[PDB]
């Protein structure tokens, strides 16, 4: 919880059973630093089924953004004020079943310049 | 034998469109076999007020 | 009753009650005369004070009937019934509904509201009447039950002067040690409470104040006065003003109790014969 | 129907792509949203009366006395209804009123 | 003037319309009973309680007996017409699945419960339904048939009362006495349903419902309120390892997690109180309770 | 189960007829005749579908035997697939180790 | 049994009542409503008779009645599914029979003495 950018979380069983449908579930395995119980995808799982309910509701909805079938699966965290209103919060990208948080174009550069100098 | 015997030869004696489906009937009362109605009140006897209400013309 | 409801049904002072009873007597008299069954001011029509005396003696008989109920009865249920009966004749006349039917009905409705869950055999067993005659009365009881609520304005809750008594005694066991073991105080207070209940006190005074006054009368009779307790209530709003109102109410209560007396049976039987003849007179309602 | 419905109108111009090809076609961004509506009716004080007053917890001589017509009893205590509920109802009701 | 026939009821029949007087919309009740006995018990206890209790309980979150008449055998009770009911609303397939709206419904229900507890009169039978939503959406409580006063004097306290699915654990045992506990545990099961979307604990009949109540919260600890088996009728239930609230409703904001843990606490003594629950910081939080202007409406 | 449906149908019919008789004096009589014949159509449809039920009541036991047959053959199909499954679990799990 | 004829007479009385109340009638047409109420009473007697009869019926009968067909079609479909399952199961057992025969043929080709002793033991 010190720095979310500097944490990586994984799990071998879910690795072979990974598909475009299951990426959200892998992020949802719980005990995963990046995702949170507060997210509504978790509230939905407590209830029955999942459909246009993320549009009926308008809140924290982790949604897959871009997907490459074998490994690459990018997830985006949105905060909706209303249907047809989306506010992007952050992006967590999964490479080879390893979840990282997408570095800001500027926090990365600041740290980089600091180490070199 | 032909098994498309009409909902007639089956229910033949009753007059009216017995063959017509429940959707076509559009009757709230008909929707009853699918979900059982509650027995809120026991059957009551006929009253003079009913006959006064009808009596045709 | 900070719970409102009885805030509307708390008649404020002696004269209004007198006036209301008088007016209902006039009302029945007039409806009957207009119907024209009789010429105006015949002998049969009663007088309001006589009607009130008959009601009080018959109500003492009704209280004995509540006491002899075979199942044990909470004091709350008896009280609820009496109050309901007094409030009923503040809207109508003795002749329009015979007092016997009204008493029995107030009692059954009361039991149903107060959750005594009475058993049907227990109620029939208590009445000393033939089963057929008790069933005839029960048929009337049904119609007169609905009639009661209609003329009761559907205001059913009744505040019973008991709960406050237990409460003040617990305050007694805690805030003031000047008096001690106030249980002699308890029985005398009960004696004052039955006498208070027979009066229009339920209608006029506040019930909590009624319990406090019973406690004060018991204390004065036995040798203690609660100036100090009155002083803890003075530890409150109105500064000095609260005490004068409390003293005036206490004095008026003492006066009514000393003046109130049971009506003599010799007078009461004359009245009974007259009323009986009265309901035996032709009313008949409508087709 | 050429004018009534689409009939290849918005299907012709497609502006390359702005969903699969690249999600950087947004450009024209906007927000400035407000509501100012939170923390409403948290307050629970609706207390009404025409009477003197009495506290909910006793922790006083009344609790120390712990005595009613039958005082308190153990088996039913599971039932709850600790005499506490008891004296509170009793006193509150008695105090209700006192001054019309 | 009767203008509509919404339908019959458990011990009543209802018609919706404008009365002999003003044109305003209201729901009219007609008394229903088995009068066949030549020795009828007059009016029913449920009716008697409901009418006076509703008349006395006047609150923005309580319905009230307004007008009342009864010239014929008929007894007429006047209650304001309401939009529908939370129960069917959440029962239906997710039409407008929304979250802070559930918190607003919970706030209205809790304010109504606080007023009823203050007036010193328990609502004996909140059930999932029996809660009504109006056009504005202010939800006021309604069915009052089974309620009773709760006081210092010892009296036969009625037993085995609330609908099986929503039942207090002490009542499930067989307890002769009771307190605000029944109403609190029941609001608790209604919140459970709003979050879970389906009923929390299912009981076909008394024993099975007690079993599931225990399976959902685990075996109550000996420390909890020992005498839990010393109340009059107790059967050791299964020795469940137990599941955290996190297990049954998987997730939500932890403040909600805390209200739940609290209404549930087993010792009837600790079941949280109405004032206590409003004072919970969950109500005063960044998520805002809906004013009801934007409250969800189905058909 | 048909006894419960018969009782519930008779109850709903008598209750709807009670509502119709209650509004019978209330309704305008000329159009009330139309509402009466509409209700008569409702009752006729309820009763003819109950007539279809009590017609099929002779054919109930054969469908009970058919359900028994279908359950039995489904059980034997699950036996075949279970045998093949346990042989696969022998050949790929236990013998490899 | 008797419930069929009773409800049939009730339905015919309902049809005659609809016909009569459809027509302007000088005669007291309240007899139609009284016969309808008496038919409801006889249907309550038939409900006592249905407590005597105790019929258990599946829901798909109700649903095919909603479609307005014969329930005899539901009987034919249950019979057809019974024969479909019996055909499939007999076919699987027949392929196992042919496979066992082929296997013992080929093993008797490749292992003479062993399949000889097996055909001896059976």
PDB file of N, CA and C in Angstrom, chain B residues 31-54:
ATOM      1  N   UNK B  31     -55.257 -15.707 -16.938  1.00  0.00           N
ATOM      2  CA  UNK B  31     -53.923 -15.878 -16.307  1.00  0.00           C
ATOM      3  C   UNK B  31     -54.132 -16.320 -14.860  1.00  0.00           C
ATOM      4  N   UNK B  32     -54.237 -17.632 -14.625  1.00  0.00           N
ATOM      5  CA  UNK B  32     -54.569 -18.147 -13.271  1.00  0.00           C
ATOM      6  C   UNK B  32     -53.973 -19.550 -13.124  1.00  0.00           C
ATOM      7  N   UNK B  33     -54.048 -20.354 -14.185  1.00  0.00           N
ATOM      8  CA  UNK B  33     -53.480 -21.734 -14.144  1.00  0.00           C
ATOM      9  C   UNK B  33     -51.960 -21.645 -13.975  1.00  0.00           C
ATOM     10  N   UNK B  34     -51.313 -20.708 -14.680  1.00  0.00           N
ATOM     11  CA  UNK B  34     -49.830 -20.589 -14.624  1.00  0.00           C
ATOM     12  C   UNK B  34     -49.377 -20.219 -13.208  1.00  0.00           C
ATOM     13  N   UNK B  35     -50.048 -19.252 -12.568  1.00  0.00           N
ATOM     14  CA  UNK B  35     -49.716 -18.894 -11.163  1.00  0.00           C
ATOM     15  C   UNK B  35     -50.993 -18.982 -10.324  1.00  0.00           C
ATOM     16  N   UNK B  36     -51.068 -19.851  -9.291  1.00  0.00           N
ATOM     17  CA  UNK B  36     -52.315 -20.037  -8.538  1.00  0.00           C
ATOM     18  C   UNK B  36     -52.774 -18.781  -7.787  1.00  0.00           C
ATOM     19  N   UNK B  37     -54.064 -18.387  -7.889  1.00  0.00           N
ATOM     20  CA  UNK B  37     -54.591 -17.249  -7.126  1.00  0.00           C
ATOM     21  C   UNK B  37     -54.796 -17.617  -5.650  1.00  0.00           C
ATOM     22  N   UNK B  38     -54.751 -16.620  -4.762  1.00  0.00           N
ATOM     23  CA  UNK B  38     -54.886 -16.881  -3.297  1.00  0.00           C
ATOM     24  C   UNK B  38     -56.372 -16.987  -2.946  1.00  0.00           C
ATOM     25  N   UNK B  39     -56.730 -17.891  -2.027  1.00  0.00           N
ATOM     26  CA  UNK B  39     -58.144 -18.013  -1.578  1.00  0.00           C
ATOM     27  C   UNK B  39     -58.376 -16.977  -0.473  1.00  0.00           C
ATOM     28  N   UNK B  40     -58.459 -15.694  -0.842  1.00  0.00           N
ATOM     29  CA  UNK B  40     -58.634 -14.611   0.161  1.00  0.00           C
ATOM     30  C   UNK B  40     -59.973 -14.764   0.888  1.00  0.00           C
ATOM     31  N   UNK B  41     -61.040 -15.095   0.155  1.00  0.00           N
ATOM     32  CA  UNK B  41     -62.389 -15.193   0.775  1.00  0.00           C
ATOM     33  C   UNK B  41     -63.093 -16.479   0.334  1.00  0.00           C
ATOM     34  N   UNK B  42     -63.889 -17.080   1.222  1.00  0.00           N
ATOM     35  CA  UNK B  42     -64.671 -18.295   0.869  1.00  0.00           C
ATOM     36  C   UNK B  42     -65.839 -17.905  -0.043  1.00  0.00           C
ATOM     37  N   UNK B  43     -66.365 -18.863  -0.813  1.00  0.00           N
ATOM     38  CA  UNK B  43     -67.482 -18.568  -1.749  1.00  0.00           C
ATOM     39  C   UNK B  43     -68.687 -18.069  -0.947  1.00  0.00           C
ATOM     40  N   UNK B  44     -69.354 -17.016  -1.437  1.00  0.00           N
ATOM     41  CA  UNK B  44     -70.501 -16.419  -0.696  1.00  0.00           C
ATOM     42  C   UNK B  44     -71.815 -16.695  -1.433  1.00  0.00           C
ATOM     43  N   UNK B  45     -72.981 -16.633  -0.748  1.00  0.00           N
ATOM     44  CA  UNK B  45     -74.288 -16.868  -1.378  1.00  0.00           C
ATOM     45  C   UNK B  45     -74.753 -15.707  -2.274  1.00  0.00           C
ATOM     46  N   UNK B  46     -75.650 -15.987  -3.226  1.00  0.00           N
ATOM     47  CA  UNK B  46     -76.192 -14.929  -4.129  1.00  0.00           C
ATOM     48  C   UNK B  46     -77.049 -13.962  -3.304  1.00  0.00           C
ATOM     49  N   UNK B  47     -77.127 -12.693  -3.717  1.00  0.00           N
ATOM     50  CA  UNK B  47     -77.878 -11.670  -2.934  1.00  0.00           C
ATOM     51  C   UNK B  47     -78.852 -10.918  -3.844  1.00  0.00           C
ATOM     52  N   UNK B  48     -79.858 -10.262  -3.260  1.00  0.00           N
ATOM     53  CA  UNK B  48     -80.843  -9.479  -4.035  1.00  0.00           C
ATOM     54  C   UNK B  48     -80.181  -8.335  -4.784  1.00  0.00           C
ATOM     55  N   UNK B  49     -79.122  -7.754  -4.211  1.00  0.00           N
ATOM     56  CA  UNK B  49     -78.427  -6.597  -4.836  1.00  0.00           C
ATOM     57  C   UNK B  49     -77.886  -6.997  -6.214  1.00  0.00           C
ATOM     58  N   UNK B  50     -77.416  -8.242  -6.349  1.00  0.00           N
ATOM     59  CA  UNK B  50     -76.892  -8.738  -7.648  1.00  0.00           C
ATOM     60  C   UNK B  50     -78.030  -8.730  -8.670  1.00  0.00           C
ATOM     61  N   UNK B  51     -79.176  -9.315  -8.310  1.00  0.00           N
ATOM     62  CA  UNK B  51     -80.323  -9.407  -9.255  1.00  0.00           C
ATOM     63  C   UNK B  51     -80.784  -7.993  -9.617  1.00  0.00           C
ATOM     64  N   UNK B  52     -80.836  -7.087  -8.636  1.00  0.00           N
ATOM     65  CA  UNK B  52     -81.235  -5.684  -8.898  1.00  0.00           C
ATOM     66  C   UNK B  52     -80.228  -5.062  -9.870  1.00  0.00           C
ATOM     67  N   UNK B  53     -78.943  -5.390  -9.715  1.00  0.00           N
ATOM     68  CA  UNK B  53     -77.900  -4.873 -10.621  1.00  0.00           C
ATOM     69  C   UNK B  53     -78.134  -5.313 -12.054  1.00  0.00           C
ATOM     70  N   UNK B  54     -78.591  -6.556 -12.253  1.00  0.00           N
ATOM     71  CA  UNK B  54     -78.819  -7.079 -13.624  1.00  0.00           C
ATOM     72  C   UNK B  54     -80.285  -6.879 -14.017  1.00  0.00           C
TER      73      UNK B  54
END
